[PDB]
Structures are given as C-alpha cells and as structure tokens.
PDB file of C-alpha atoms in Angstrom:
ATOM      1  CA  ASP Q   4       0.000   0.000   0.000  1.00 37.26           C
ATOM      2  CA  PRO Q   5       2.875   2.476  -0.469  1.00 34.25           C
ATOM      3  CA  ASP Q   6       1.026   3.526  -3.626  1.00 35.55           C
ATOM      4  CA  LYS Q   7      -2.278   3.804  -1.764  1.00 33.55           C
ATOM      5  CA  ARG Q   8      -1.248   7.112  -0.188  1.00 33.69           C
ATOM      6  CA  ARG Q   9       0.364   8.470  -3.353  1.00 33.31           C
ATOM      7  CA  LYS Q  10      -3.104   8.268  -4.893  1.00 34.61           C
ATOM      8  CA  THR Q  11      -4.605   9.921  -1.816  1.00 30.99           C
ATOM      9  CA  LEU Q  12      -2.294  12.940  -1.986  1.00 30.19           C
ATOM     10  CA  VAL Q  13      -3.245  13.407  -5.637  1.00 26.16           C
ATOM     11  CA  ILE Q  14      -6.912  13.417  -4.630  1.00 23.37           C
ATOM     12  CA  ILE Q  15      -6.231  15.953  -1.881  1.00 26.37           C
ATOM     13  CA  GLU Q  16      -4.514  18.389  -4.245  1.00 27.22           C
ATOM     14  CA  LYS Q  17      -7.199  17.845  -6.883  1.00 29.23           C
ATOM     15  CA  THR Q  18      -9.855  18.629  -4.280  1.00 29.53           C
ATOM     16  CA  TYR Q  19      -7.959  21.527  -2.709  1.00 28.90           C
ATOM     17  CA  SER Q  20      -8.046  23.259  -6.093  1.00 26.71           C
ATOM     18  CA  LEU Q  21     -11.821  22.828  -6.209  1.00 28.88           C
ATOM     19  CA  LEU Q  22     -12.118  24.166  -2.663  1.00 26.66           C
ATOM     20  CA  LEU Q  23     -10.333  27.439  -3.409  1.00 27.88           C
ATOM     21  CA  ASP Q  24     -12.602  27.859  -6.433  1.00 32.18           C
ATOM     22  CA  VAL Q  25     -15.715  27.222  -4.342  1.00 31.46           C
ATOM     23  CA  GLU Q  26     -14.483  29.676  -1.709  1.00 29.22           C
ATOM     24  CA  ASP Q  27     -14.114  32.175  -4.550  1.00 30.32           C
ATOM     25  CA  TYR Q  28     -17.796  32.058  -5.511  1.00 30.15           C
ATOM     26  CA  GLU Q  29     -18.526  34.884  -3.076  1.00 27.83           C
ATOM     27  CA  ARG Q  30     -16.260  37.228  -5.035  1.00 26.10           C
ATOM     28  CA  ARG Q  31     -16.944  36.227  -8.650  1.00 23.12           C
ATOM     29  CA  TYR Q  32     -20.599  36.736  -7.726  1.00 23.87           C
ATOM     30  CA  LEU Q  33     -20.615  40.455  -6.919  1.00 26.22           C
ATOM     31  CA  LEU Q  34     -19.520  41.446 -10.429  1.00 23.39           C
ATOM     32  CA  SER Q  35     -21.940  39.298 -12.429  1.00 22.24           C
ATOM     33  CA  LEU Q  36     -25.245  40.007 -14.179  1.00 18.58           C
ATOM     34  CA  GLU Q  37     -28.589  39.061 -12.630  1.00 18.01           C
ATOM     35  CA  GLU Q  38     -29.091  36.160 -15.042  1.00 21.60           C
ATOM     36  CA  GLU Q  39     -25.851  34.648 -13.743  1.00 21.78           C
ATOM     37  CA  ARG Q  40     -26.979  34.456 -10.088  1.00 20.68           C
ATOM     38  CA  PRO Q  41     -29.049  31.269 -10.447  1.00 16.72           C
ATOM     39  CA  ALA Q  42     -26.716  29.662 -12.995  1.00 11.96           C
ATOM     40  CA  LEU Q  43     -23.582  30.467 -10.993  1.00 10.26           C
ATOM     41  CA  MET Q  44     -25.039  28.824  -7.889  1.00 10.13           C
ATOM     42  CA  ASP Q  45     -25.849  25.715  -9.920  1.00 11.97           C
ATOM     43  CA  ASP Q  46     -22.236  25.481 -11.069  1.00 11.40           C
ATOM     44  CA  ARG Q  47     -21.253  25.927  -7.424  1.00 11.93           C
ATOM     45  CA  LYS Q  48     -23.416  22.959  -6.427  1.00 13.97           C
ATOM     46  CA  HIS Q  49     -21.792  20.662  -8.985  1.00 12.39           C
ATOM     47  CA  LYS Q  50     -18.319  21.482  -7.669  1.00 14.99           C
ATOM     48  CA  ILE Q  51     -19.409  20.929  -4.069  1.00 12.28           C
ATOM     49  CA  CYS Q  52     -20.632  17.484  -5.106  1.00 13.86           C
ATOM     50  CA  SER Q  53     -17.376  16.973  -7.002  1.00 16.74           C
ATOM     51  CA  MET Q  54     -15.472  17.478  -3.751  1.00 16.12           C
ATOM     52  CA  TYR Q  55     -17.972  15.319  -1.871  1.00 14.54           C
ATOM     53  CA  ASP Q  56     -17.463  12.441  -4.310  1.00 14.09           C
ATOM     54  CA  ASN Q  57     -13.697  12.838  -3.947  1.00 15.28           C
ATOM     55  CA  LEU Q  58     -14.189  12.077  -0.252  1.00 13.91           C
ATOM     56  CA  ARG Q  59     -16.500   9.095  -0.303  1.00 13.05           C
ATOM     57  CA  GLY Q  60     -14.701   8.346  -3.530  1.00 15.61           C
ATOM     58  CA  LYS Q  61     -17.755   7.280  -5.473  1.00 14.34           C
ATOM     59  CA  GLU Q  66     -21.540  -0.027  -6.119  1.00 16.04           C
ATOM     60  CA  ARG Q  67     -21.679   2.043  -2.936  1.00 17.07           C
ATOM     61  CA  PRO Q  68     -18.225   3.463  -2.305  1.00 16.14           C
ATOM     62  CA  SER Q  69     -15.674   1.606  -0.178  1.00 17.68           C
ATOM     63  CA  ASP Q  70     -15.789   3.005   3.331  1.00 19.63           C
ATOM     64  CA  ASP Q  71     -12.000   2.946   3.260  1.00 19.32           C
ATOM     65  CA  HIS Q  72     -11.386   5.549   0.557  1.00 20.07           C
ATOM     66  CA  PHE Q  73     -12.562   8.337   2.860  1.00 17.17           C
ATOM     67  CA  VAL Q  74     -10.734   6.846   5.845  1.00 17.14           C
ATOM     68  CA  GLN Q  75      -7.269   6.977   4.267  1.00 16.36           C
ATOM     69  CA  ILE Q  76      -7.692  10.679   3.500  1.00 18.00           C
ATOM     70  CA  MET Q  77      -8.535  11.132   7.181  1.00 16.37           C
ATOM     71  CA  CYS Q  78      -5.031   9.886   7.983  1.00 15.27           C
ATOM     72  CA  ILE Q  79      -3.082  12.716   6.351  1.00 16.37           C
ATOM     73  CA  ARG Q  80      -2.393  16.056   8.052  1.00 12.82           C
ATOM     74  CA  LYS Q  81      -3.491  18.374   5.241  1.00 14.09           C
ATOM     75  CA  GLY Q  82      -6.281  15.918   4.457  1.00 13.07           C
ATOM     76  CA  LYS Q  83      -8.082  16.220   7.786  1.00 13.29           C
ATOM     77  CA  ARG Q  84      -7.871  20.018   7.644  1.00 13.40           C
ATOM     78  CA  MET Q  85      -9.254  20.123   4.106  1.00 12.63           C
ATOM     79  CA  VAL Q  86     -12.275  18.108   5.231  1.00 12.90           C
ATOM     80  CA  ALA Q  87     -12.943  20.692   7.942  1.00 13.17           C
ATOM     81  CA  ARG Q  88     -13.209  23.363   5.242  1.00 13.37           C
ATOM     82  CA  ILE Q  89     -15.301  21.203   2.911  1.00 15.84           C
ATOM     83  CA  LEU Q  90     -17.874  20.361   5.590  1.00 17.80           C
ATOM     84  CA  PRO Q  91     -19.420  23.863   5.823  1.00 17.95           C
ATOM     85  CA  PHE Q  92     -20.030  23.798   2.058  1.00 18.66           C
ATOM     86  CA  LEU Q  93     -21.623  20.342   1.933  1.00 17.01           C
ATOM     87  CA  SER Q  94     -25.387  19.918   2.268  1.00 17.96           C
ATOM     88  CA  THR Q  95     -27.011  18.554   5.426  1.00 18.73           C
ATOM     89  CA  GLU Q  96     -27.310  15.097   3.863  1.00 17.51           C
ATOM     90  CA  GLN Q  97     -23.728  15.038   2.572  1.00 17.08           C
ATOM     91  CA  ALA Q  98     -22.351  16.319   5.879  1.00 16.25           C
ATOM     92  CA  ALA Q  99     -24.486  13.848   7.830  1.00 19.31           C
ATOM     93  CA  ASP Q 100     -22.854  11.037   5.860  1.00 19.95           C
ATOM     94  CA  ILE Q 101     -19.296  12.294   6.339  1.00 23.23           C
ATOM     95  CA  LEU Q 102     -19.970  12.546  10.074  1.00 20.54           C
ATOM     96  CA  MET Q 103     -21.511   9.069  10.238  1.00 22.54           C
ATOM     97  CA  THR Q 104     -18.463   7.503   8.600  1.00 19.60           C
ATOM     98  CA  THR Q 105     -16.086   9.414  10.843  1.00 20.99           C
ATOM     99  CA  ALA Q 106     -17.740   7.959  13.944  1.00 20.83           C
ATOM    100  CA  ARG Q 107     -17.960   4.490  12.395  1.00 18.77           C
ATOM    101  CA  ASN Q 108     -14.206   4.511  11.763  1.00 17.96           C
ATOM    102  CA  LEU Q 109     -13.225   6.794  14.644  1.00 19.24           C
ATOM    103  CA  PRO Q 110     -11.020   4.476  16.758  1.00 18.79           C
ATOM    104  CA  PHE Q 111      -8.747   3.884  13.761  1.00 21.05           C
ATOM    105  CA  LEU Q 112      -8.717   7.551  12.749  1.00 21.99           C
ATOM    106  CA  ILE Q 113      -7.851   8.404  16.353  1.00 24.41           C
ATOM    107  CA  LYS Q 114      -4.999   5.890  16.345  1.00 25.60           C
ATOM    108  CA  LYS Q 115      -3.585   7.609  13.261  1.00 27.13           C
ATOM    109  CA  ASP Q 116      -4.232  11.052  14.745  1.00 29.64           C
ATOM    110  CA  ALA Q 117      -2.102  10.253  17.795  1.00 26.89           C
ATOM    111  CA  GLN Q 118       1.024  11.767  16.235  1.00 28.14           C
ATOM    112  CA  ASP Q 119      -0.451  14.844  14.554  1.00 31.59           C
ATOM    113  CA  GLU Q 120      -3.356  15.658  16.884  1.00 30.51           C
ATOM    114  CA  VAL Q 121      -5.402  17.733  14.431  1.00 30.70           C
ATOM    115  CA  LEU Q 122      -8.842  16.117  14.740  1.00 32.00           C
ATOM    116  CA  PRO Q 123     -10.193  18.851  17.080  1.00 33.83           C
ATOM    117  CA  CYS Q 124     -10.513  21.107  14.016  1.00 35.25           C
ATOM    118  CA  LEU Q 125     -13.488  19.022  12.882  1.00 33.89           C
ATOM    119  CA  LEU Q 126     -15.416  19.707  16.089  1.00 31.66           C
ATOM    120  CA  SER Q 127     -16.615  23.172  15.060  1.00 31.99           C
ATOM    121  CA  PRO Q 128     -18.236  22.281  11.698  1.00 34.18           C
ATOM    122  CA  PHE Q 129     -19.854  19.129  13.116  1.00 33.74           C
ATOM    123  CA  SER Q 130     -21.344  20.999  16.077  1.00 29.77           C
ATOM    124  CA  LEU Q 131     -23.246  23.293  13.711  1.00 29.62           C
ATOM    125  CA  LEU Q 132     -24.486  20.400  11.569  1.00 32.90           C
ATOM    126  CA  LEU Q 133     -26.284  18.701  14.460  1.00 30.80           C
ATOM    127  CA  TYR Q 134     -28.888  21.471  14.668  1.00 33.38           C
ATOM    128  CA  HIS Q 135     -30.057  20.523  11.178  1.00 32.11           C
ATOM    129  CA  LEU Q 136     -30.425  16.879  12.195  1.00 32.20           C
ATOM    130  CA  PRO Q 137     -33.629  15.506  13.798  1.00 32.25           C
ATOM    131  CA  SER Q 138     -33.914  13.163  16.783  1.00 31.51           C
ATOM    132  CA  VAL Q 139     -33.524  10.127  14.524  1.00 33.07           C
ATOM    133  CA  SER Q 140     -30.098  11.165  13.238  1.00 30.38           C
ATOM    134  CA  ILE Q 141     -28.861  12.191  16.689  1.00 30.85           C
ATOM    135  CA  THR Q 142     -29.623   8.824  18.287  1.00 29.06           C
ATOM    136  CA  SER Q 143     -28.400   7.001  15.178  1.00 28.45           C
ATOM    137  CA  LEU Q 144     -25.076   8.839  15.425  1.00 31.56           C
ATOM    138  CA  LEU Q 145     -24.852   8.039  19.136  1.00 30.36           C
ATOM    139  CA  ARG Q 146     -25.315   4.313  18.529  1.00 31.66           C
ATOM    140  CA  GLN Q 147     -22.539   4.171  15.936  1.00 29.59           C
ATOM    141  CA  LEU Q 148     -20.210   6.461  17.886  1.00 29.30           C
ATOM    142  CA  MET Q 149     -20.482   4.259  20.974  1.00 29.53           C
ATOM    143  CA  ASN Q 150     -20.643   1.226  18.679  1.00 31.42           C
ATOM    144  CA  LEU Q 151     -23.733  -0.507  20.060  1.00 32.72           C
ATOM    145  CA  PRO Q 152     -24.521  -4.084  18.923  1.00 34.82           C
ATOM    146  CA  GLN Q 153     -26.710  -4.493  15.835  1.00 34.35           C
ATOM    147  CA  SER Q 154     -28.888  -6.768  17.965  1.00 34.78           C
ATOM    148  CA  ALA Q 155     -29.631  -3.717  20.123  1.00 36.01           C
ATOM    149  CA  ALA Q 156     -29.057  -5.891  23.196  1.00 35.58           C
ATOM    150  CA  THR Q 157     -27.689  -3.794  26.066  1.00 36.49           C
ATOM    151  CA  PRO Q 158     -24.052  -4.831  26.676  1.00 33.63           C
ATOM    152  CA  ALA Q 159     -23.035  -5.364  30.306  1.00 33.17           C
ATOM    153  CA  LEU Q 160     -19.341  -4.786  29.605  1.00 32.97           C
ATOM    154  CA  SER Q 161     -17.266  -2.128  27.847  1.00 31.55           C
ATOM    155  CA  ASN Q 162     -16.010  -2.282  24.261  1.00 35.37           C
ATOM    156  CA  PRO Q 163     -12.724  -1.174  22.610  1.00 35.06           C
ATOM    157  CA  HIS Q 164     -14.564   1.201  20.263  1.00 35.27           C
ATOM    158  CA  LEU Q 165     -16.477   3.273  22.822  1.00 33.06           C
ATOM    159  CA  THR Q 166     -13.531   3.293  25.233  1.00 33.38           C
ATOM    160  CA  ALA Q 167     -11.138   4.700  22.632  1.00 36.73           C
ATOM    161  CA  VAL Q 168     -13.624   7.554  22.247  1.00 36.20           C
ATOM    162  CA  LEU Q 169     -13.730   8.561  25.915  1.00 35.84           C
ATOM    163  CA  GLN Q 170      -9.939   8.514  26.273  1.00 35.53           C
ATOM    164  CA  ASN Q 171      -9.709  10.928  23.340  1.00 38.09           C
ATOM    165  CA  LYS Q 172      -9.990  14.716  23.151  1.00 37.43           C
ATOM    166  CA  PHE Q 173     -12.100  14.885  19.989  1.00 40.67           C
ATOM    167  CA  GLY Q 174     -14.025  11.675  20.636  1.00 41.47           C
ATOM    168  CA  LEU Q 175     -15.245  12.683  24.088  1.00 39.32           C
ATOM    169  CA  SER Q 176     -16.079  16.158  22.781  1.00 38.52           C
ATOM    170  CA  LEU Q 177     -18.182  14.850  19.894  1.00 39.76           C
ATOM    171  CA  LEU Q 178     -20.068  12.603  22.317  1.00 37.97           C
ATOM    172  CA  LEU Q 179     -21.002  15.474  24.637  1.00 38.05           C
ATOM    173  CA  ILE Q 180     -22.378  17.745  21.911  1.00 38.57           C
ATOM    174  CA  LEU Q 181     -24.381  14.846  20.476  1.00 38.61           C
ATOM    175  CA  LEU Q 182     -25.986  14.351  23.880  1.00 41.34           C
ATOM    176  CA  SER Q 183     -26.295  18.114  24.312  1.00 41.39           C
ATOM    177  CA  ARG Q 184     -28.133  18.304  20.993  1.00 45.40           C
ATOM    178  CA  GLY Q 185     -30.235  15.315  22.016  1.00 47.37           C
ATOM    179  CA  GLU Q 186     -31.169  17.400  25.045  1.00 44.94           C
ATOM    180  CA  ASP Q 187     -32.666  20.084  22.802  1.00 41.69           C
ATOM    181  CA  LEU Q 188     -35.029  17.750  20.945  1.00 39.26           C
ATOM    182  CA  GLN Q 189     -35.975  16.062  24.219  1.00 38.20           C
ATOM    183  CA  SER Q 190     -37.289  19.024  26.219  1.00 38.45           C
ATOM    184  CA  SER Q 191     -39.281  20.358  23.258  1.00 35.22           C
ATOM    185  CA  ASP Q 192     -41.198  17.101  22.803  1.00 33.89           C
ATOM    186  CA  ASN Q 201     -38.248   8.110  24.043  1.00 32.69           C
ATOM    187  CA  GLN Q 202     -35.365   6.494  22.162  1.00 32.45           C
ATOM    188  CA  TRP Q 203     -32.782   8.324  24.270  1.00 34.26           C
ATOM    189  CA  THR Q 204     -33.756   6.244  27.306  1.00 38.78           C
ATOM    190  CA  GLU Q 205     -31.799   3.362  25.772  1.00 39.53           C
ATOM    191  CA  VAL Q 206     -28.874   5.426  24.470  1.00 40.14           C
ATOM    192  CA  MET Q 207     -28.542   7.693  27.510  1.00 39.75           C
ATOM    193  CA  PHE Q 208     -28.150   4.760  29.900  1.00 42.43           C
ATOM    194  CA  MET Q 209     -25.091   3.642  27.940  1.00 41.05           C
ATOM    195  CA  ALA Q 210     -23.568   7.129  27.881  1.00 38.14           C
ATOM    196  CA  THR Q 211     -24.091   7.924  31.564  1.00 39.04           C
ATOM    197  CA  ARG Q 212     -23.067   4.455  32.744  1.00 39.68           C
ATOM    198  CA  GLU Q 213     -19.830   4.353  30.755  1.00 38.29           C
ATOM    199  CA  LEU Q 214     -18.973   7.869  31.920  1.00 39.40           C
ATOM    200  CA  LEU Q 215     -19.728   6.683  35.452  1.00 40.21           C
ATOM    201  CA  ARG Q 216     -17.119   3.944  35.058  1.00 38.63           C
ATOM    202  CA  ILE Q 217     -14.000   5.046  33.181  1.00 38.00           C
ATOM    203  CA  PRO Q 218     -11.536   6.417  35.790  1.00 40.07           C
ATOM    204  CA  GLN Q 219     -11.010  10.182  36.062  1.00 39.55           C
ATOM    205  CA  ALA Q 220      -7.447  10.023  34.731  1.00 38.27           C
ATOM    206  CA  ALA Q 221      -8.375   7.742  31.824  1.00 38.30           C
ATOM    207  CA  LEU Q 222     -11.129  10.041  30.551  1.00 40.90           C
ATOM    208  CA  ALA Q 223      -9.785  12.882  28.399  1.00 40.54           C
ATOM    209  CA  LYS Q 224     -10.195  16.664  28.538  1.00 40.17           C
ATOM    210  CA  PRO Q 225     -13.108  17.943  26.398  1.00 40.14           C
ATOM    211  CA  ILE Q 226     -12.352  20.860  24.071  1.00 39.15           C
ATOM    212  CA  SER Q 227     -15.607  22.457  25.202  1.00 41.29           C
ATOM    213  CA  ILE Q 228     -18.461  21.688  27.595  1.00 43.36           C
ATOM    214  CA  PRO Q 229     -22.167  22.006  26.694  1.00 40.84           C
ATOM    215  CA  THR Q 230     -23.963  24.028  29.375  1.00 39.20           C
ATOM    216  CA  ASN Q 231     -27.190  22.013  29.231  1.00 38.40           C
ATOM    217  CA  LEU Q 232     -25.490  18.790  30.334  1.00 39.80           C
ATOM    218  CA  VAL Q 233     -26.361  18.905  34.040  1.00 42.66           C
ATOM    219  CA  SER Q 234     -30.050  19.043  33.119  1.00 45.86           C
ATOM    220  CA  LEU Q 235     -29.821  16.230  30.569  1.00 46.39           C
ATOM    221  CA  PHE Q 236     -28.059  13.833  32.948  1.00 47.87           C
ATOM    222  CA  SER Q 237     -30.421  14.542  35.851  1.00 49.29           C
ATOM    223  CA  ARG Q 238     -33.182  13.098  33.665  1.00 48.31           C
ATOM    224  CA  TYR Q 239     -31.803   9.566  33.943  1.00 47.41           C
ATOM    225  CA  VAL Q 240     -29.859   9.382  37.215  1.00 47.21           C
ATOM    226  CA  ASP Q 241     -30.085  10.294  40.900  1.00 48.24           C
ATOM    227  CA  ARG Q 242     -28.468  13.127  42.862  1.00 48.12           C
ATOM    228  CA  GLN Q 243     -25.594  10.869  43.934  1.00 45.75           C
ATOM    229  CA  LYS Q 244     -24.626   9.727  40.431  1.00 40.81           C
ATOM    230  CA  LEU Q 245     -25.353  13.201  39.068  1.00 40.76           C
ATOM    231  CA  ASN Q 246     -22.798  14.774  41.405  1.00 39.39           C
ATOM    232  CA  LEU Q 247     -20.271  12.227  40.137  1.00 42.19           C
ATOM    233  CA  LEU Q 248     -20.876  13.108  36.487  1.00 40.95           C
ATOM    234  CA  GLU Q 249     -20.395  16.771  37.392  1.00 43.44           C
ATOM    235  CA  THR Q 250     -17.075  16.010  39.084  1.00 40.24           C
ATOM    236  CA  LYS Q 251     -15.381  14.044  36.299  1.00 40.32           C
ATOM    237  CA  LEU Q 252     -16.748  16.044  33.360  1.00 44.10           C
ATOM    238  CA  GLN Q 253     -16.048  19.366  35.093  1.00 45.37           C
ATOM    239  CA  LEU Q 254     -19.703  20.282  34.552  1.00 45.26           C
TER     240      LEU Q 254
END
C-alpha cells in the first residue's frame, strides 16, 4: 500500500483546487449580471458534489477511501473546510463515517493531533439533524450491537472515544443536541443509559479533557440518574 497514499495525496490536491474555487464564488458573484446568479449557484453545487465524491470516492463506495484521507495532516484540515459547504445530507454522511471509523482515525491522529478542528463544523451540523439522526449517530459512535441488546461490559470502540480529546467532545455535543429535541417534545432512554453508565465507570485520569463543555449537560443527565450519580458526572466532566 505504499502507492495507496500516493493516490490519496493526488486526490487531496485535486480537491484543494476545487475548494479554493468554491471559496471564490462569493467574489466572482458580486460582479456578475442578474441572469448569472441562479446559474452560478448551480455550477457551485456541482463542484461541491465533485469534492464530496472525492471524499467518499464514489456499487456504494468503499468506506476505506474516505478513511485513508482522514489519515493525512493536510487531508483532515481540508475536510474541515469542505464540511461547511456540503449539504445537510452530505455532511451527515461524512460525520456518520467518521464515527464508524473513529477508533482507527484516532490511532492515526495520535502523532499529529489535528482532529479537534473538525469539532466546530460538526457541532453546527447537528442542529439541522432531527432526533432520529442524533440517536443514530450516538449508537454508531459508541458502537452498540446491531442486535440492540444492552451490553453489560465495555467495548474497545467506545472506550477509545472517551480517552480521546475529539471523541469525548463529539459525544457530549451529540448528547447536548439530544437534550434540545428532548425538552421540546423516548429512544434516548436506551442510548442515555449507555452514555451515563460508561462515563460513570471510566476512571477520572483515563477520561480525556473535552475541548468544550455544553452548558445544558447537568439538566440532561439529571433526567436519567439520581443526585448521587449526578454529582459524580459533574465532578469528572467538570460540569
């Protein structure tokens, strides 16, 4: 696979050129006729999808093509800039895959430590996603069994997430977002138990330091636990 990355770099540079052109739409737009406004946005869409396809690499695309790109320094940063341009559906897919292959991506991020850059774009995307997507993302992130049978023990996938800066951060905002849909009018009752329990297990030192901390966490946790376990979640998470 020494040639596998040589192909990846080519894709990155090919996509980076598209990016700078897409980021230039704002300018080439202010000096164009009225007739061009609809047509120029259409051309912008096609390029955004061109970048999107360069990620998934599209029968249905190998889930590995996008993973390898998420192993290169300049590759992970490029994705962070492509996310804001992608549509809700496209971005929801990129996020899903990231969580599905997170432990590996984290292992490869150990040296560089540049994953945190993806936290900002993803946090904004969640508010376009309904309750279904939120819970669905939580199941994959924590890697719950397909059989939906509540595990009594921990798993390598979920654990690697809590001991990570980005991983733990992404988990909190997903719950935080899940808190929004909840109060405004349950599938969370089965996903929350797993989140709270695992957080109420992994030792203080093992758990990593979140980049940020959602304010509405104390309220969300108090919905599923008692005052004694709640005070523990507040201690470890620095709530």
